[PDB]
Amino acid sequence: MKLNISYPTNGTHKTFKLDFKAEQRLYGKKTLDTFDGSIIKPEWEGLQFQITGGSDVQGFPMIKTLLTDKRKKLLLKKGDKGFKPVNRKGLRKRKTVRGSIIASDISMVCVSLIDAKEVAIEGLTDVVVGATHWPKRFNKLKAKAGFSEDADVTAEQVLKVIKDAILEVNAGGIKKLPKLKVSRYQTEKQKERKAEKIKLIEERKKKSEKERADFLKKYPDWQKKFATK
Amino acid sequence: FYEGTCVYSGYPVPRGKGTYFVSLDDKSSLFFSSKYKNFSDKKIKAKRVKQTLMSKQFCGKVESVHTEKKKKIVVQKIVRGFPALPKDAVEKIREQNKDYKK
RNA sequence: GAGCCUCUAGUGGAUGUUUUACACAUGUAAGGGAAUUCGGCAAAAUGGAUGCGUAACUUCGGGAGAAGUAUUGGUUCAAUUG
RNA sequence: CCUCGUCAUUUAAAUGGUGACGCGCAUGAAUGGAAUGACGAGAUUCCCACUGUCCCUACAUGUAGACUAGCGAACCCAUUU
RNA sequence: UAGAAAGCGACGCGGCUUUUUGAUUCUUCGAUGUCGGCUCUUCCUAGCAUGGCCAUGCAGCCGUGGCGAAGUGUUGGAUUGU
RNA sequence: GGAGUGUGGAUUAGUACGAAAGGAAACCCACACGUGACCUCUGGUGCAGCGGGUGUGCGGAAGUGCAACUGCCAUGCUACGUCUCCUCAAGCAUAGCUGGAAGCCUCUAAGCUAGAAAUGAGUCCUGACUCUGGAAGACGGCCGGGAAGACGACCCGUAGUUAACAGCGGUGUUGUACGAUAUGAGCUUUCUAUUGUAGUAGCGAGUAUUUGAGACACUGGUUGUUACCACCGUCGU
RNA sequence: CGGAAGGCUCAGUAACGGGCGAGUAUUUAAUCUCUAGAACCGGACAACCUCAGGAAACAGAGGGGAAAACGGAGUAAGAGCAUGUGUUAGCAUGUGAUGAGAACAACAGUGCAGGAGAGUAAGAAGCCAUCCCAUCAGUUAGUAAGUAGGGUAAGGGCCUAUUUAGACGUAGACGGGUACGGGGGAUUAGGGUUUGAUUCCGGAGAGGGAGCCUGAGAGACGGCUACCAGGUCCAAGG
């Protein structure tokens, strides 16, 4: 049996083999259970872990809401874990899955360490990493731009963030400089187009409203002439 | 060591006692004793047999999975943790921004 | 004026001991279902009322309750014998 | 009689049952002959249901029986077994 | 297949057994309950299986003829009183 | 007196042997029939114990008789359950060794070796006549029990972890007591004060709470209370 | 945005299967004409990054991040009901469930929200014509009708409750056997007799039966789900 450990403060991962006695002490648990590291290893006292998921040795996934030690077949839609539909909308299919309760069937258990405390777990504690992408949306970007509850042109914040990258990362360089872009804030091309729609409605009104009066000048007896079919 | 959990009663079964009954539907099922197997055959609903663990859970006399209403532990706000920007500098920028905003 | 239970009126003694085996009157039984025996002998199974549905043959009267199937307690209502 | 007659059907297996056949030891017409219905505590074969009849027996109840108080015989008998 | 005699053995001749049916009338007619089955025990050997051996027309497999041996086994059914 | 008997699978092996086709030979493991015991498990049985309904009795409810029906089930008993079953010695038939008669030969005339599910012993059941020991008292009845039992007999106890009743712990069987209270498909509109207001209800199967409740047993655990120290006979010094 | 068309066949069906008229009691993405739009906020899913399962087919944890994708806020709009007034749109008044929305590029354009009328396609309807056996004469009880309600995009026994007994038959009902139906083909002086799987139109099916999600539109099978009859691969678990 493998054990796969994630440390979400650091963004780091490690896999280990268990021994028999360690394994046998996990039996009976389920996803979203917790335990103390001392039950897996000597030391590791007070490290609290939470169980995330895993896999049958046949390869079927453990599902978070099927509380049994057995395999079932379920009918699954899009948005259900264990199924990945592609080429037709409204497709639903029947697949084998395993319940959440841990036993000798399982090949791998996934686990999250909540807090490393004073301990020095190799690989988990020795590295710190960030994200992969950058906040495109304006208000998400602003919070990261350190500001809150004040008004700027986007250019200001793009300048701040770029300069800080040049300074803090490279101390000067053309490296970094990912292609920062901003959504949900009005640029000048939008100011013009958003003015134009106001021009349209104002004329369409007057033109429509004119013809009504122009008609009534000529046809006082509109209704009595028209209605006699 | 246990043999398993009885299907009808809900009772855990000691090693070396009880029996499995296998139906033509292809299912295998474990019973504590002849008493509860017979009650199944005669279509007595388990929730009405008041000494069963099943009945006691259903009535709410015994705490069970349905009572739990569990929810994910809520955390707090952090000093804006964002790529590159060191945690400590945001602790400073946020303050400086708050000043300027006033 | 069946069987079962009660009112009026009438009724009873070879003593003590928890008492093996084999008997005589009776109950119940896993899985199998006449393999038992000259032979289903003995036992089990079916059973009242209401409705649906009923074959060959026949002296046309019958066969016929043919066979085969379903319903049935307590309570509170409508409707008046359905 | 020969005889458990031959052929078909019923069974895993038929000295049985039913259907055919007929030189019938020794069938046969009010010494009454032949084909049916309704009705037999009449004789015979098979099927469904049902079961301690059986495989293969086990446990339990009442009444007798064993032991004890009161009462108290008979069949049979050359007898040394 | 050669060849009396592995296995057979015509035509004749000598024995044993009482499990078949006869033959005879010794015992019982002032009474010895008569066929078959069910149940249960013991004995015999003229040996069907199981153990040890000898011959072979015994390559092996399967057999066939003989010797000492009676410890343990030899069933469930259909028709029929058998 | 007597007891274990047989079948199959795997391996040797597609081997020896045969032109080919075919085709053998210990040890180990599974089973059946027979024998002797045993209840931990699983079936069966329901005498003690807990529940349910039908007809009719004790004015209602509660507790219950009679006719009998029905669900579960301690201890016990049982098989459809579980455990059980080989080793020596002398030697049959036979095949051999040495060896004369009979200078050669020869299993036999003396002598020796290998030898059967058969025979005789041991392990297994019954237990004749015996043998070793203690002590001036011993033993039987009467009283109370069972692991034993037709009656005798056997195993035991009598001022004590003795018996019986209660607490308080422990281990089971049944299935949620009586009485209150709340609800209930529906059906109904009664009373007091007094002129007009206020007061103001009945009848009902069942279901939920109090309540894994109440009932019943056993305890070689522990506390309290109560009862029991006799008597008669026989043989001996 | 398309995969609901086209292609293949004639099993089933004596019938909305076929010919002629009519346009409703109905729904319709695209397309046309007229008209026509001031709106804020939030998370995820897939790919990406780090581990990493399974014989394969196929999947896991953890962390970022978009939309003209998605969910909420306000706001226009707004079903039904009731009364006036104009059949009947429309308008007035009262009451209101519900409740949104796309821009982008300049090679000089392409899109997307609402209405009203067209256009295309279905659903349901009117009339008339349709094979053999009487050795098949009675058939039917949602059957025939009425009142009221549910259901549907919509009329209707389509379905259900209480009332009325109807409906169809020798001018052949009901049962059984058989059949894709026309435009047309072969023979023919005339009157006829025979055939139509088969270029066009319409219907039904995808081994046999039955259920279904998505969508403007399928009871779809080069979509899904279960049984029955058959198969294929395995490391025996799928």
Decide: residue A191, CB within 10 A, 0-12 exposed, 13-18 middle, 19+ buried.
Answer: exposed
Give the burial string for B85-100 (b: 16+ CB within 10 Å, else e): beeeebeebbeebeee
Q: How far is B4 from chain A (nearest CA, A)?
A: 11
Q: Are strands A106-113 and A2-7 parallel, antiparallel or unpaired?
A: parallel
A65 reaches B (C-beta below 8 A) = no
The single-letter DSSP state of residue B70 is -
Tokens in use for A45? 């006292």
**Alpha-carbon distances, residue A201 vs A193, A198, A209 (angstroms):** 13, 6, 12
The token duo for A80 is 């259900």
> DSSP string spanning A139-173?
HHHHHHTT--S----HHHHHHHHHHHIIIIIISS-
Which chain G nucleotides are covered by protein, judged by CB under 7 A? 2-3, 35-39, 41-43, 45-54, 56-67, 87-89, 103-105, 213-215, 220, 223-226, 237-238
Sort A229 into a burial class: Cβ within 10 Å, 0-12 / 13-18 / 19+. Answer: exposed
Experimental technique used to determine this entry: cryo-EM
Read off the amino acid at residue B69. Answer: K
Cβ contacts (< 8 Å) between A134 and chain B: which residues?
83
CA distance A132 to chain B (A): 9
Tell if B34 CB is < 7 Å from nucleic strand F. yes
Q: CA A43, CA A47: separation in Å to the nearest integer?
A: 9
**Through-space separation of residue A194 CA and nucleotide G112 C1' in angstroms:** 16
Query: B82: which chain A residues are within 8 Å (Cβ-Cβ)?
Result: 143-144
- Kindly state the DSSP code that residue A115 receives in the 8-state scheme: -
